[PDB]
């Protein structure tokens, strides 16, 4: 329980963006 | 014989000579703290040690380091006296020099810059008083020494209740001085477990893997190796001839062409003798015996490189073939015996989920900090940090010593961390114990109970203060710039200072001093406590540890301990006991070599004493000191029996050494049942001192030691003659043998005068010496409260008669003659501190001005212009001590109130009366007034007068100092000048100031003149600087609390005499509460007509068996007798000869006592003075267990002219008729405990109320009502009285409506109640409804 | 046994006294249990006459008024 | 609410409540910003946690208060309160109109009153006083009334005597156990700060005088006055509710008096003479002519009401002593002289009271009881009983018994040295003789102490029961018991080592002699365990009564006769010997299930 844990693990799934990927999304924006 | 001994001598019964005399009773408290604050150039406990552990602090790898140089304690901001008044702590600033080194980046280590910040200030640590007390906030607090479990290893049992199968268990516990706990424990299955701290149990082997031990080395460690050889064909085996003991033969066992044993015949010592003597090393074995044997190491097939069997696996007959065909000559197996060498570890591995070191390290890390993902660095780092880091773990010296000791090691000193061998050795011993070799220790032995005490304790807290500063320090060195910061900007103060302050301030070991009285002080100071941090709690420990133990002899007082929730959690220290070098308790003993009793004393600890045979304190030896009887009672090991004449290795030092100062003061203790004795020594401390110090009439002999050792009395530092005696000070002119060459000197004793105790008694000294009297070093110059001539007087002894007196003494009630209250003997002086605080409100500042709304001039009489009561005005309840008014604007009065002012024409003030007034009923004389002001508010008139007055008094005092001092020094110069240049009439002519010019012939005496000059000039200026600071200390605007502009403390000295309701008790555990105060007329009187002071009820005696109270009465009587006799010969004025004869007669008293005596004493001045002191009574000494005997008492009663029965005829003062039967009358010492009734009495009609729940609450000290509890409610329910009960819990208390609605009816004269609903429940209703619950009140 | 028999009591306010409160309140709150008082412990809590002794006369007069018309 | 120095103090719920709001509000925002799911979810979890901590904290994580380590208290913790299960009705509630202080004796009191300090009574009745003061018009208005009593004007004291007269106060002591822990008394104004308490009542309260304090409560409402007078008044409970025996029985001094009163020696002044009646018996005694105890014939008139509601009278010559004769003046009516003609120990002296009650009714028993106390103290006061050190008489044979028993132990040791007896068998063996020895010394000193007063009337000698002080105490029932006496004179016991074995070298000395070092030390363990043991047995008792009232409580006598014939058969306990407890006590006051027969029937 203790939501720090169920949070830490829920975001920990998300992979860091590549330097190129940021611009892609930003372009998408 | 000494000087205060010539004044009064105590006749001492008892035989046994005192070989050792009682050392300073305050040692522990003093020695300890002395080690704490001290400069020790090594690791002995002190600030140095606590500094040296955590320092130096290095940054994180950054090669930026901060080390520690030195420390010092600055002089206190305020002195002790000022510190109580002001309310502050007696403390010294701690100034520590720090050295900051910076390594050139990417070193070889060399420094860029090192800034030495001079002594950055961290905290003010409290200081211990000359008497061993602390003053935290204006309140004396004492820190009780602690008794806890010794660091080390401990092997316990825990048999019985668990699992209800018996089988016991055996657990080991490694308790470090600092750092985590390591526990090993068995289970019903014999599976070895470990738990760190109290945490989850984990299978033991898991730590070994974490210590980097593969399965194979664990088996190799805990088990022996059974060697199997396949030599020729089919299965031979290596055989140790001893292995076959305790087992029965599974087949024909035959080797060496001689068959030693057949199948089914158990192998005994015969077979073993045969095997050993025939030296049969190797035998041939069958292929089926290895079906059960577990293989030791791993065994693989050499060719195929495949794992045949893992280590610690049970072999089978098929498996043997598969590793045999692989070319394996040797197969190693375990030695397993369910009796001798268990097979524990093997099965422990089988419950272990782990495999490799990292695996084990992980299971631990997730055990210790679960829920978070383990990491390699995390499992490794934490585990290396638990027991192996110099930072987080220490057993210190004691831990390592007992550790090594319990492991049968040699070294008493070693590493402060754990080594793989250490853990391993411990596991080995536990298993050895489970195997039956070894025994378990027991916690209750005093070899396992260690004593700390204040010094060590302050160091521990201070240590914690330093680690919590360490984290911060690293934090700053994280980002650091080179040259800007220095060792100040980092280290804070408050954290450490409030850390240390919380210790002395609120701690289970820190306490007030409730009542003044030397025994109470001196008895706390040697208190032990098994409670508090690092100790057990009442709820935790049961009766085993509370109970008295054999090792307590001579160490802990058996009979002095509190009776209550914690019994045996306190005890008290014994008389001759001492703290061990390492911190155990050791006691004095006498070495008996061959058959002679040697007077060399030897201190033996609980374990040292174990093996020796020690004789008894009560024994008869003589001449050469050969034990008189051929066999004597002794205690040797935990037991006592008759021992041969020369067996005893040692003997008890004294007869007292079992008890404590509290118990040792009970006369004829040997005559009291232990329950009552405890109670006696428990009550004796509650004695409030009295107005006239009496002296014990019946006694023991410790009273001298108690008076002196406690600082209450004032003892001479050096011997000499008294120059000046005032009720204020005492000046002693030192003798030259005791005098130091420089400064010459005289010792000036400034006596304490009437002053405040930790609420509310008075502590006041009286000079006991006269003008121009010889004093020897260590003589009492002045008694304090409850000391008389150097003895301990907690009360006044008095004439007492045992007999029912018309029931007024009914249960324990005591019936007292008016003579006592008239004699003011039991009168007592209390000094109370009342304060008036002028705060700041958002509405405005509060004025102390004397203009107070709605008071006549008669009220304002007792006040000066300023609003402060004059010093010395006698006052009662309601009197205005300090005028105070606080702004409250816009009263908003009401119509009818507006008319009221209109008719009587009063201007209703913008100010409300806050003035401090005397509590109801209490009445006294003002002995003092103090005025504290915020820095910056203009001091008022009166306060200014005070500043001027205190200033002059200081100047007068310092000047007086300098004057006596100067005279003392120049008077020495006069004497040195007379040698080599004597001028008698010539020298004292010229001005004394001009003396410094005259020289001398070449000699050291010229250089001696040199010496006295130097010290003179120092004093001349030391005076100057001393005055200035004092002047500065007076004038300085005092620091106050937030919001307070100024404070006025008035000091009242209440004098209370005695009244029905006060508690009184003797030393024997007889309590009592005076019931009636009787006229002298009704007091039972004897034929001579001398009434009796107190009439005690005899019925209390048999039931409570305290028979000493009776002897104390009898002997008491006789003592008074010898007095009365002397009182006539002195009123006869016979002569020194006649007096001398009789006194000598008394002090001998028929045979075999140890006292000795006079005619060496100067036959004139000395004898007559003594006699004058004996006429009140003859002070007698009954040593505790050596005490007097009936015959001696009867014999002493014979000299008295008084009967042996100790009973006389007594006559009722009312009818004048006789009393059938004789009644015992005599002199019993009696105490006034401080329960005095006008404290206990309280009553409330309508008071203040709690806000949160409207309930009676004392806010004014007009006390909240009495609490009507659950049990009392049941009582009303058993009677049928509901209304009493309803009115109790509704209108009389909780109904905010009903309460006023009632009162209005009560005055109206209508007794009713219109109850409504108790507000308590009314809140529960909202509280339930605040949750999600809809709770409603139905119907009608 | 006494401690077990004392467990069951119709009035929930009484049980809330000496038993574990959270459990008492919930388990009651679901059932909509209606406490009619009638006992001692409870009348003391709410603070009215004990339905015994002097009050026994009262409760009598009210108890019958209840379940009446 | 604010505090001094401007500091504030607040309930912990705010910290809790505040959080639920913040988190809640943030969530409302996070919806309009259409934040990603991972966030609103997290916020949602956080919102749940906050409500949990608000409602009942501790079922998940235990949130801690701000800057303060201690966990903040939630509403569920508000309801629970603490000290086990106590909802503020159960632990207790502070109450107005009450007070308390130390209590003392007051033998003068009648049993229905108690000594109350003047000031406590002033402050306690303050509102009542105000009302009477302006009822008579001695005070213009209520304010002035306050000023008067605050001034303590002389007139109020007399007014207080009025409002006090008929107005009981409740007195209570600390561990209230049975209902007698609270009893009502009529106040008597007393100078001094101590409460004076009638001695006869001291037993019911278990109140010693060693400084026990009692608390006082004023019953306000009229019904409380009438409840107090007819229920909680002292005189209306004279009998223990636990068993019908009187709980007002005189305690110790009084029983020593009456025993010393009625006792007789063999030869004493006035022995043999004859007197008309008790009046002149006291007249003989007070004058110094006759001894309190001497065998004497006197004419007495007793009464028996055995008629129908009617007292018979009979006069006769009874062979008695002077003391019993004197005492007869008190016994009211009905009772026979037979009741006082004995030695009057504590047991008989109680049944005296009992019969008096079960025969004459209540009022006479009270007034009888008062009289018994007054007279008890008094004559006990005349007697001059005391205790000196020579009142405890050691047997002349003690040293000899010890020595013989000392041979036995050395004999059995030789039998163990030679292996004739096993070690375990030995321990029991030595203990058996020592146990036996102590009994011997006890029943030795008891024989000497009890009767050895050996005296002469006109002849050589004769011997009666001792008049020695300490024996009189134990025989009378006043205080002390053969057990405690045995420790004074005879040797005291065989102590026990902490583990529970009992030491085989008993304590051979006693208190009249000294105990030496070793012996005292051994005594300590037993002592310390006692105090420890008692304080725990104290707690257990309390715990038991708790469970007990909980299982019963609401049970009340409701109907009149259920009218069931059903019932249990009562027999005396008759354990293995004769009558460990009779039938007459078991059936008393119960009601018969069915008519019982004589040995013949239709009877
Ligand atoms: Mg008591």
The two three-digit tokens of residue D540, written as one number? 């257990």
Flag whether D562 is marked binding. Answer: yes
Please provide the DSSP assignment of D150-200 as one string. HHT-HHHHHHHHHHHTT--EEEE-SS--SGGGEEEEEEEEESSSSEEE-GG
Calculate how close chain D gets to B1311, using CA atoms only, in Å.
Answer: 5
CB nearest C39 (choices: D223, D551, D554): D554
Residues D123, D125, D127, D133, CA torsion sign: negative
- Distance in angstroms (rounded) separating the CA atoms of residues D99 and D121: 9
The two three-digit tokens of residue D116, written as one number? 């109350």
- Distance in angstroms (rounded) separating the CA atoms of residues B479 and D148: 76
Strands (E), B992-1107: 1046-1056, 1064-1066, 1074-1078, 1094-1096
Please indicate if any CB of chain C lies within 8 Å of the CB of B1273.
yes
> Do you find a cis peptide bond into B286, omega within 30 degrees of 0?
no
- Distance in angstroms (rounded) separating the CA atoms of residues D225 and D232: 10
Query: Could you tell me the fold of the domain covering B828-946+1044-1056?
Result: OB fold (Dihydrolipoamide Acetyltransferase, E2P) (2.40.50)
Angle at B283 between CA B278 and CA B284, to 5 degrees: 150
Please indicate if any CB of chain C lies within 8 Å of the CB of D62.
no
Contacts made by residues B617-626, CB under 8 angstroms, sequence distance 24+: B617/B16, B617/B651, B617/B652, B617/B653, B617/B654, B617/B655, B617/B657, B617/B658, B617/B1185, B617/D517, B618/B16, B618/B655, B618/B1185, B618/B1186, B618/D516, B618/D517, B619/B651, B621/B597, B624/B596, B625/B596, B625/B597, B626/B595, B626/B596, B626/B597
Pairing mode, strands B1180-1181 and B698-699: parallel
Instruction: Supply φ then ψ for residue B1137, to 5 degrees.
Output: -65, -55
- Distance in angstroms (rounded) separating the CA atoms of residues D129 and D116: 16
- Distance in angstroms (rounded) separating the CA atoms of residues D181 and D101: 16
Q: What resolution in angstroms does the PDB record give?
A: 3.6
Exposure b/e, B299-320, CB count within 10 A at least 16 = b: bebeeeeeebbebbbbbeeebb
The two three-digit tokens of residue B1077, written as one number? 């105060």
Do chains A and C touch, with touching meaning 3 or more CB–CB pairs less than 8 Å apart?
A: no
| B1315·C48 Cβ contact <8 A | yes
Cβ D298 vs Cβ D279: under 8 Å: no
| DSSP code of residue D228 | I
Distance of CA B1309 to the CA centre of its chain: 58
Nearest CA in chain A to D48: A3
Nearest CA in chain C to B1295: C47
| DSSP-assigned beta bridge partners for residue B640 | B635
Cβ B686 vs Cβ B1235: under 8 Å: yes
- Distance in angstroms (rounded) separating the CA atoms of residues B1050 and B833: 6
C contacts of B1321 (beta carbons < 8 Å): 45-47
Contacts made by residues D555-561, CB under 8 angstroms, sequence distance 24+: D556/C51, D556/C52, D556/C56
Q: Structure solved using which method?
A: X-ray
| C25·D547 Cβ contact <8 A | no
- Distance in angstroms (rounded) separating the CA atoms of residues B107 and B424: 40
- Distance in angstroms (rounded) separating the CA atoms of residues B477 and B282: 70
Q: HSE on the CB side for B138, CA within 13 Å? A: 10
Cβ B177 vs Cβ B394: under 8 Å: yes
- Distance in angstroms (rounded) separating the CA atoms of residues C50 and B207: 65
User: Which chains sit next to A, with 3 or more Cβ pairs under 8 A?
Assistant: D
Q: B1072 alpha carbon to ligand 1 midpoint, in Å? A: 10
| A1·D60 Cβ contact <8 A | yes
The two three-digit tokens of residue D40, written as one number? 């609103």
- Distance in angstroms (rounded) separating the CA atoms of residues B173 and B156: 8
Is B749 buried (19+), middle (13-18) or exposed (0-12) by CB count in 10 A?
A: middle
Q: B510 alpha carbon to ligand 1 midpoint, in Å? A: 28
Could you give the 3-state DSSP secondary structure of residue B768?
coil
Cβ D468 vs Cβ D451: under 8 Å: no
Q: Which residue is listed with tokens 């102390």? A: B848
- Distance in angstroms (rounded) separating the CA atoms of residues B869 and B875: 10
Cβ B1319 vs Cβ B1295: under 8 Å: yes
Nearest CA in chain D to C24: D80
Residues with Cβ within 8 Å of residue B270, at least 6 apart in sequence:
none
Rg (CA), chain A: 14
Exposure b/e, B1115-1134, CB count within 10 A at least 16 = b: bbbbbbbbbbbbbebeeeee
Q: What is the 3-state secondary structure (H, E, C) of D125-151?
A: CHHHHHHHHHHCCCCCCHHHHHHHHHH
Please indicate if any CB of chain B lies within 8 Å of the CB of C33.
no
- Distance in angstroms (rounded) separating the CA atoms of residues D50 and B451: 47
| B1205·D388 Cβ contact <8 A | yes
Instruction: Supply φ then ψ for residue B1016, to 5 degrees.
Output: -55, -55
Q: Which residue is listed with tokens 């502050």? A: B88
Best residue in C17, C44, C51, C66 for a mutation probing chain B (most B CBs within 10 Å): C44
If residue D313 lies in a helix (H) or strand (E), which one and from where to where?
A: strand D312-321
C contacts of D89 (beta carbons < 8 Å): 17, 44-45, 47
Cα(first)–Cα(last) distance of chain C, in Å? Answer: 41
C contacts of D79 (beta carbons < 8 Å): 21, 25
Q: D211 alpha carbon to ligand 1 midpoint, in Å? A: 6
- Distance in angstroms (rounded) separating the CA atoms of residues B628 and D203: 55
Write out the residues surrounding ion ligand 1, Cβ under 5 A: D 208, 210
C contacts of B1294 (beta carbons < 8 Å): 47
| C56·D550 Cβ contact <8 A | no
Cβ C41 vs Cβ C20: under 8 Å: no
The two three-digit tokens of residue B594, written as one number? 């061959």
- Distance in angstroms (rounded) separating the CA atoms of residues D169 and B214: 82
Q: Residue B479's CB: how many other CB atoms inside 10 A?
A: 7
């Amino acid at each position: 329980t203790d939501p720090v844990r169920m949070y830490m693990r829920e975001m920990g799934t998300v992979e860091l963006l590549t330097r190129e990927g940021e611009i892609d999304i930003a372009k998408r924006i | 014989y000494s000087y205060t001994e010539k004044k009064r001598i105590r006749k001492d019964f008892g035989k046994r000579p005192q070989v050792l005399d009682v050392p300073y009773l305050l040692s522990i408290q003093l020695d300890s703290f002395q080690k704490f604050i001290e400069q020790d150039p090594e690791g002995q406990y002190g600030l140095e040690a606590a500094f040296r552990s955590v320092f130096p602090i290095q940054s994180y790898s950054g090669n930026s380091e901060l080390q520690y140089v030195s420390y010092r304690l600055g002089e206190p901001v305020f002195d002790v006296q000022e510190c109580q008044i002001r309310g502050v702590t007696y403390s010294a600033p701690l100034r520590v020099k720090l050295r900051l080194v910076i390594y050139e980046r990417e070193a070889p280590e060399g420094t860029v810059k090192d800034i030495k910040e001079q002594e950055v200030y961290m905290g003010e640590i409290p200081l211990m008083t000359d008497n061993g007390t602390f003053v935290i906030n204006g309140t004396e607090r004492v820190i009780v020494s602690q008794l806890h479990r010794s660091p080390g290893v401990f092997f316990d049992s825990d048999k019985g209740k668990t699992h209800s199968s018996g089988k016991v268990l055996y657990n080991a516990r490694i308790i470090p001085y600092r750092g985590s706990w390591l526990d090993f424990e068995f289970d019903p299955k014999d599976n070895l477990f470990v738990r760190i701290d109290r945490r989850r149990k984990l299978p033991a082997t898991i730590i070994l893997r974490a210590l980097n031990y593969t399965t194979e080395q664990i088996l190799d460690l805990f088990f022996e190796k059974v060697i199997f050889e396949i030599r020729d064909n089919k299965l031979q085996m290596e055989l140790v001839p001893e292995r076959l003991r305790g087992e029965t033969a599974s087949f024909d066992i035959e080797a060496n062409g001689k068959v030693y044993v057949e199948k089914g015949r158990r192998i005994t010592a015969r077979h073993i003798r045969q095997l050993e003597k025939d030296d049969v090393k190797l035998i041939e074995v069958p292929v089926e015996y290895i079906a059960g044997k577990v293989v030791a190491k791993d065994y693989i097939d050499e060719s195929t490189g495949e794992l045949i069997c893992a280590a610690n696996m049970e072999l089978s007959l098929d498996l043997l073939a598969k590793l045999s065909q692989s070319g394996h000559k040797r197969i190693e197996t375990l030695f397993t015996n369910d009796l001798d060498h268990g097979p524990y570890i093997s099965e422990t591995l089988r419950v272990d989920p782990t495999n490799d070191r990292l695996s084990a390290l992980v299971e631990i890390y997730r055990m210790m900090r679960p829920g978070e993902p383990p990491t390699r660095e995390a499992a490794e780092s934490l585990f290396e940090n638990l027991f192996f880091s110099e930072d987080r773990y220490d057993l210190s010296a004691v831990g390592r010593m007992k550790f090594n000791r319990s492991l049968l090691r040699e070294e008493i000193e070693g590493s402060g961390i754990l080594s793989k061998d250490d853990i391993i050795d411990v596991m080995k011993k536990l298993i050895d114990i489970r195997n039956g070799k070894g025994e378990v220790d027991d916690i209750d032995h005093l070899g396992n109970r260690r004593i700390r005490s204040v010094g060590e304790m302050a160091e521990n807290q201070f240590r914690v203060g330093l680690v919590r500063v360490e984290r911060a320090v690293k934090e700053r060195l994280s980002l650091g710039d080179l040259d800007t910061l220095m060792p100040q900007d980092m280290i804070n103060a408050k954290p450490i200072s409030a850390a240390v302050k919380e210790f002395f301030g609120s701690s289970q070991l820190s306490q007030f001093m409730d009542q003044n009285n030397p025994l109470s002080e001196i008895t706390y100071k040697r208190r032990i406590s098994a409670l508090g941090p690092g100790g057990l709690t009442r709820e935790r420990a049961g009766f085993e540890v509370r109970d008295v133990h054999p090792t307590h002899y001579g160490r802990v007082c058996p009979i002095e301990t509190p009776e209550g929730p914690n019994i045996g959690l306190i005890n008290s220290l014994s008389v001759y006991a001492q703290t061990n070098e390492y911190g155990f308790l050791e006691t004095p003993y006498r070495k008996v070599t061959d058959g002679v009793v040697t007077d060399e004393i030897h201190y033996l600890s609980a374990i040292e004493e174990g093996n020796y045979v020690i004789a008894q304190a009560n024994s008869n030896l003589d001449e050469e000191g050969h034990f008189v009887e051929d066999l004597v009672t002794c205690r040797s090991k935990g037991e006592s029996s008759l021992f041969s004449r020369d067996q005893v290795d040692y003997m008890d030092v004294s007869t007292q050494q079992v008890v404590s100062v509290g118990a040792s003061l009970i006369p004829f203790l040997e005559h009291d049942d232990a329950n009552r004795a405890l109670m006696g020594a428990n009550m004796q401390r509650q004695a409030v001192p009295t107005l006239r110090a009496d002296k014990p009439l019946v006694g023991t002999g410790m009273e001298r030691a108690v008076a002196v050792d406690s600082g209450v009395t004032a003892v001479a530092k050096r011997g000499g003659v008294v120059q000046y005696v005032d009720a204020s000070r005492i000046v002693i002119k030192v003798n030259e043998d005791e005098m130091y060459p420089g400064e010459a000197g005289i010792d000036i004793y400034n006596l304490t005068k009437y002053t405040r105790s930790n609420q509310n008694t008075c502590i006041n000294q009286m000079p006991c010496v006269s003008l121009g009297e010889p004093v020897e070093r260590g003589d009492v110059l002045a008694d304090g409260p409850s000391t008389d001539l150097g003895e301990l007087a907690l009360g006044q002894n008095m004439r007492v008669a045992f007999m029912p007196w018309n029931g007024y003494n009914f249960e324990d009630s005591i019936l007292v003659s008016e003579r006592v209250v008239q004699e003011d003997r039991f009168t007592t002086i209390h000094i109370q501190e009342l304060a008036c605080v002028s705060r700041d409100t958002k509405l405005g500042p509060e004025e102390i001005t004397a203009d107070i709304p709605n008071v006549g001039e008669a009220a304002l009489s007792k006040l000066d212009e300023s609003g402060i009561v004059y010093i010395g005005a006698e006052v009662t309840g309601g009197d205005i001590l300090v005028g105070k008014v606080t702004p409250k604007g816009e009263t908003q009065l009401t119509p009818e109130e507006k008319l009221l002012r209109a008719i009587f024409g009063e201007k209703a003030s913008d100010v409300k009366d806050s003035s401090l007034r005397v509590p109801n009923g209490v009445s006294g004389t003002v002995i003092d007034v103090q005025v504290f002001t915020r820095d910056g508010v203009e001091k008022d008139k009166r306060a200014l007068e005070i500043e001027e007055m205190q200033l002059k008094q200081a100047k007068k005092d310092l000047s007086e100092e300098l004057q006596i001092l100067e005279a003392g020094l120049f008077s020495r110069i006069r004497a040195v000048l007379v040698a080599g240049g004597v001028e008698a009439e010539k020298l004292d002519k010229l001005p004394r100031d001009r003396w410094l010019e005259l020289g001398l012939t070449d000699e050291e005496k010229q250089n001696q003149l040199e010496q006295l000059a130097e010290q003179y000039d120092e004093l001349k200026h030391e005076f100057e600087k001393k005055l200035e600071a004092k002047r500065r200390k007076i004038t300085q605007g005092d620091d106050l609390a937030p919001g307070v502009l100024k404070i006025v403390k008035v000091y009242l000295a209440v004098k209370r005499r005695i009244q029905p309701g006060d508690k009184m008790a003797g030393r024997h555990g007889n309590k009592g509460v005076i019931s009636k105060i009787n006229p002298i007329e009704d007091m039972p009187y004897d034929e001579n007509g001398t009434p009796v002071d107190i009439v005690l009820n005899p019925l209390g005696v048999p039931s409570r068996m305290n028979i000493g109270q009776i002897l104390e009465t009898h002997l008491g009587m006789a003592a008074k007798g010898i007095g009365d006799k002397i009182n006539a010969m002195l009123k006869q004025q016979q002569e020194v000869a006649k007096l001398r004869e009789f006194i000598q007669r008394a002090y001998d008293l028929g045979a075999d006592v140890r006292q000795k005596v006079d005619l060496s004493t100067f036959s004139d001045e000395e004898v007559m003075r003594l006699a004058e002191n004996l006429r009140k009574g003859m002070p007698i000494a009954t040593p505790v267990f050596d005490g007097a005997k009936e015959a001696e008492i009867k014999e002493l009663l014979k000299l008295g002219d008084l009967p042996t029965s100790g009973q006389i005829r007594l006559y009722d003062g009312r009818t004048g008729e006789q009393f059938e039967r004789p009644v015992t009358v005599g002199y019993m010492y009696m105490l006034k405990l401080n329960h005095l009734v006008d404290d206990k009495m309280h009553a409330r009609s309508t008071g203040s109320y709690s806000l949160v729940t409207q309930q009676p609450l004392g806010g004014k000290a007009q006390f909240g009502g009495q609490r009507f509890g659950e049990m009392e409610v049941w009582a009303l329910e058993a009677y049928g009285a509901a209304y009493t009960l309803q009115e109790m819990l509704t209108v009389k208390s909780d109904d905010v409506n009903g309460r006023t609605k009632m009162y209005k009816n009560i005055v109206d004269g209508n007794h009713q109640m219109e109850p409504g609903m108790p507000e308590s429940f009314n809140v529960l209703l909202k509280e339930i409804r605040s949750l999600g619950i809809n709770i409603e009140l139905e119907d009608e | 046994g006494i401690t077990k028999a004392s467990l069951a009591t119709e009035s929930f306010i009484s049980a809330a006294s000496f038993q574990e409160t959270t459990r008492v309140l919930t388990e009651a709150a679901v059932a909509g249990k209606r406490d009619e008082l009638r006992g001692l412990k409870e009348n003391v809590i709410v603070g009215r006459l004990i339905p015994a002794g002097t009050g026994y006369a009262y409760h009598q007069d009210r108890m019958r008024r209840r379940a009446a018309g | 609410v604010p505090l001094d120095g401007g500091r504030f103090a607040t309930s912990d719920l705010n910290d809790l409540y505040r959080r639920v709001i913040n988190r809640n509000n943030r969530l409302k925002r996070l919806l309009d910003l259409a934040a990603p799911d991972i966030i609103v979810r997290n916020e949602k979890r956080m919102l749940q946690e906050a409500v949990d901590a608000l409602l009942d904290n501790g079922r998940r994580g235990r949130a801690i208060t701000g800057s303060n380590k201690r966990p903040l208290k939630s509403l569920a913790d508000m309801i629970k309160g603490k000290q086990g299960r106590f909802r503020q009705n159960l632990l207790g509630k502070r109450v107005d109109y009450s007070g308390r202080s130390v209590i003392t004796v007051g033998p003068y009191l009648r049993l229905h009153q108690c000594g109350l300090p003047k000031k406590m009574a002033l402050e306690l009745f303050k509102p009542f006083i105000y009302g009477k003061l302006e009822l008579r018009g001695l005070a213009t208005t209520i304010k002035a009334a306050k000023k008067m009593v605050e001034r303590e004007e002389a007139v109020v004291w007399d007014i207080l005597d009025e409002v006090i007269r008929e107005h009981p106060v409740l007195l209570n002591r600390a561990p209230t156990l049975h209902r007698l822990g609270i009893q009502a008394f009529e106040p008597v104004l007393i100078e001094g700060k101590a409460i004076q308490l009638h001695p006869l009542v001291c037993a019911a309260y278990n109140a010693d005088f060693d400084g026990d304090q009692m608390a006082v409560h004023v019953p306000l409402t009229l019904e409380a006055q009438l409840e107090a007078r007819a229920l909680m008044m002292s005189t209306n409970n004279i009998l223990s509710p636990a068993n019908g025996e009187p709980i007002i029985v005189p305690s110790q001094d009084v029983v020593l008096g009456l025993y010393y009163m009625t006792r007789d020696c063999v030869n004493a002044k006035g022995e043999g003479m004859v007197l008309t009646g008790p009046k002149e018996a006291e007249r003989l005694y007070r004058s110094g002519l006759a001894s309190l105890h001497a065998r004497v014939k006197v004419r007495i008139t007793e009464y028996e009401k055995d008629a129908n509601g009617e007292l018979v009278a009979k006069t006769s010559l009874k062979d008695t002593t002077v003391g019993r004769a004197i005492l007869w003046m008190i016994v009211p009516k009905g009772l026979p002289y037979s009741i006082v003609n004995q030695a009057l120990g504590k047991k008989a002296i109680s049944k005296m009271l009992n019969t008096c009650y079960r025969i004459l009714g209540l009022k006479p028993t009270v007034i009888f009881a008062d009289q018994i106390m007054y007279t008890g103290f008094a004559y006990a006061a005349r007697s001059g009983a005391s205790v000196g050190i020579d009142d405890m008489v050691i047997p002349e044979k003690k040293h000899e018994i010890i020595s013989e028993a000392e041979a036995e132990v050395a004999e059995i040791q030789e039998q163990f040295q030679s292996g004739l007896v096993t070690a375990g068998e030995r321990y029991n063996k030595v203990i058996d003789i020592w146990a036996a020895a102590n009994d011997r010394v006890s029943k030795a000193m008891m024989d000497n102490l009890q009767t050895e007063t050996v005296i002469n009337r006109d002849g050589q000698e004769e011997k009666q029961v001792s008049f020695n002080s300490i024996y009189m105490m134990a025989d009378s029932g006043a205080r002390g018991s053969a057990a405690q006496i045995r420790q004074l004179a005879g040797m005291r016991g065989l102590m026990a080592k902490p583990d529970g074995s009992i030491i085989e070298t008993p304590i051979t000395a006693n208190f009249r002699e000294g105990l030496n070092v070793l012996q005292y030390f051994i005594s300590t363990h037993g002592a310390r365990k006692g105090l420890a043991d008692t304080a725990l047995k104290t707690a257990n008792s309390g715990y038991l009564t708790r469970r007990l009232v909980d299982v019963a409580q609401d049970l009340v006598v409701t109907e009149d006769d259920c009218g069931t014939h059903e019932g249990i058969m009562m027999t005396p306990v008759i354990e293995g010997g004769d009558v460990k407890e009779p039938l007459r006590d078991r059936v008393l006051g119960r009601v018969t299930a069915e008519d019982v027969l004589k040995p013949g029937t239709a009877d």
